[PDB]
Design a protein around this ligand. Structure first.
Ligand SMILES: Cc1cc2nc3c(=O)[nH]c(=O)nc-3n(C[C@H](O)[C@H](O)[C@H](O)COP(=O)(O)O)c2cc1C
Length: 174
């Protein structure tokens, strides 16, 4: 029901794919969409603010483009700075236990590339393992990701169908 979408794109105005995906949620009740590079242009994160928002939602969605098979660096900094002892883990660290955790990621390469025998050799499930392990450690339930391939070169209509598929997935109950 209550879904926090944390979008991590260095320039959401120049973005093509993630911008389109984000647009489909600007009116869905229950959705809190945020543009983190926009809110923290100097990457100085308000830890308590972030923590408090996670607390108030039932599902947390990390949305980003696939950059070198990982995320943009602000998400990495977000994990490091926000997920603290006594909050996310550790003795009292139980604030996220029970909440849902999912990744929505767009990739330039085709789906064919992400498999054994394909040009990138590994399935997306393999590449996203740091995020799944993060989920595992902090007590959240790891949901299947939303993945969009051929991002940027897939075509006008394909992108539109991709966007509507993104919306259904993010709102889907599992
Ligand atoms: C620095 C950088 C690294 C990238 N690394 C990958 C990658 O490892 N695998 C891949 O499929 N695409 C990669 N891409 C292409 C992006 O995934 C693609 O631009 C993005 O998913 C969708 O773009 P948009 O939301 O900004 O429109 C990379 C792009 C940039 C700029």
């Amino acid at each position: 029901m209550k879904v926090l979408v944390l979008a991590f794109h260095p320039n959401m105005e120049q973005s093509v794919v993630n911008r389109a995906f984000a647009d489909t949620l600007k009116d869905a009740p229950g959705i809190t969409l945020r543009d983190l590079y926009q809110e923290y242009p100097d990457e100085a994160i308000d830890v308590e603010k972030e923590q408090k928002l996670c607390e108030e939602h039932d599902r947390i969605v990390f949305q980003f483009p696939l950059y070198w098979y990982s995320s943009p660096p602000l998400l990495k900094k977000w994990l490091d700075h926000v997920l603290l002892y006594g909050w996310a883990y550790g003795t009292n660290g139980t604030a996220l236990r029970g909440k849902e955790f999912m990744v929505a990621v767009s990739a330039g390469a085709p789906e064919e590339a992400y498999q054994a025998g394909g040009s990138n050799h590994y399935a997306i499930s393999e590449l996203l393992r740091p995020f799944q392990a993060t989920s595992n450690f902090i007590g959240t339930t790891y949901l299947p990701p939303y993945v969009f391939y051929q991002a940027g070169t897939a075509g006008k209509s394909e992108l539109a169908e991709g966007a509507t598929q993104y919306r259904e997935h993010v709102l889907k109950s599992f």
